[PDB]
Amino acid sequence: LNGSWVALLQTRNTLNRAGIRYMMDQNNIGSGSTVAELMESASISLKQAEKN
Amino acid sequence: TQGYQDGFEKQYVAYMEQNDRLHDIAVSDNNASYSQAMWILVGVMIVVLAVI
């Protein structure tokens, strides 16, 4: 349950940062990893919760 | 912050995994004491019955 709950936090935390990255594209503030890369990390973290 | 966050996760999951190994070895080694403690009981009977 530790890694499972941690996996959910990493997923939720990643989704929170993912939405912030999308706001930068609308307001044009700096650059970095695209939104597709951030969403992919949340997907891997989401599946990690099911495994744990 | 993603680097520092993910950095601790590697040592976090690695540290928790080490606790399981050290705990399983303790339970595994404990099983030996449980078995040996049982053979001593039956072993004492071989000496008692031999004395009787």
Method: cryo-EM
Question: What is the rounded CA–CA span in Å between residue B31 and residue B24?
Answer: 10
Return the SS3 of A15. Answer: helix
CB contact under 8 A, B16 and A2: yes
CB contact under 8 A, B13 and A17: no
Length of chain B: 52
CB contact under 8 A, A10 and B16: no
**Burial call B8-19: b when 16+ CB within 10 Å, e when fewer:** eeeeeeeeeeee
CB atoms near residue A49 (< 10 Å): 16
Show me where chain A is broken: residue before each gap, C-N > 2.5 A: none
Question: What is the rounded CA–CA span in Å between residue A36 and residue A18?
Answer: 9
Q: Tokens representing B49?
A: 């019955």
Place of tokens 């935390």: A13
Question: What is the rounded CA–CA span in Å between residue A34 and residue B27?
Answer: 47
Residues 22-51 of B with CB under 8 A from A: none
Rg of chain A over Cα atoms, rounded to whole angstroms, equals: 12
Looking at CA atoms only, how far is residue A17 from chain B in angstroms? Answer: 10
